Amino acid sequence: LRQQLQQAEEALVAKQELIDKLKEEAEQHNIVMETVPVLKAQADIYKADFQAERHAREKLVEKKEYLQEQLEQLQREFNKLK
Amino acid sequence: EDLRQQLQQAEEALVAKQELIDKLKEEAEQHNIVMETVPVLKAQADIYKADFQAERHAREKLVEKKEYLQEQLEQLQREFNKL
């Protein structure tokens, strides 16, 4: 009897099946990975804009502190006449 | 005699089969490592978009204060211009 070699064959079919599962998953991995370029692009521009927004807003704060002391100074220059 | 000797060809396959399995099981591990790049980028896209909107909205609010402050800087100076 060669029930030894129906072992060499049982495992062998088991391995080929793993290979086929593995490949299916490598395929799925490959599709989902095509999505990365778009995600990378989206993340990049949205980070550049966020930084430009916050930049231009920082610059508003400084231009508004300035205008608060243009009023402050004009009210005190004005009040001394009245 | 040879009716048994066909594992000597089966094991020459049982082996070249972990050849693929490993060049795969280890490819799969770099497949999942680089796959981590996606929830993060996804997170950054829509979180940085949210932050951009919030910053845009605060920019908005500041432009209002900025212009409601020059509407006061004008009409007060028009009265100071009566000298």
Curated annotation (Swiss-Prot), chain A:
Signal peptide: none annotated. Changing Y46A: Abolishes linear polyubiquitin-binding, impairs 'Lys-63'-linked polyubiquitin-binding and impairs NF-kappa-B activation. There is a cross-link at K15, K21, K23, N30, K40, K47, K59, K63, K64 (Glycyl lysine isopeptide (Lys-Gly) (interchain with G-Cter in ubiquitin)). Residues 1-82 are annotated as: Ubiquitin-binding (UBAN). Changing R57A: Abolishes linear polyubiquitin-binding, no effect on 'Lys-63'-linked polyubiquitin-binding and impairs NF-kappa-B activation. It is found in: Cytoplasm; Nucleus. Changing E65A: Abolishes linear polyubiquitin-binding. Changing V38A: Abolishes linear polyubiquitin-binding, impairs 'Lys-63'-linked polyubiquitin-binding and impairs NF-kappa-B activation. Residues 1-82 are annotated as: Self-association. Residues 1-82 are annotated as: Linear polyubiquitin-binding, does not bind to 'Lys-63'-linked polyubiquitin. It comes from the Eukaryota. Regulatory subunit of the IKK core complex which phosphorylates inhibitors of NF-kappa-B thus leading to the dissociation of the inhibitor/NF-kappa-B complex and ultimately the degradation of the inhibitor. Its binding to scaffolding polyubiquitin plays a key role in IKK activation by multiple signaling receptor pathways. Can recognize and bind both 'Lys-63'-linked and linear polyubiquitin upon cell stimulation, with a much highr affinity for linear polyubiquitin. Could be implicated in NF-kappa-B-mediated protection from cytokine toxicity. Essential for viral activation of IRF3. This is NF-kappa-B essential modulator. It comes from Mus musculus.
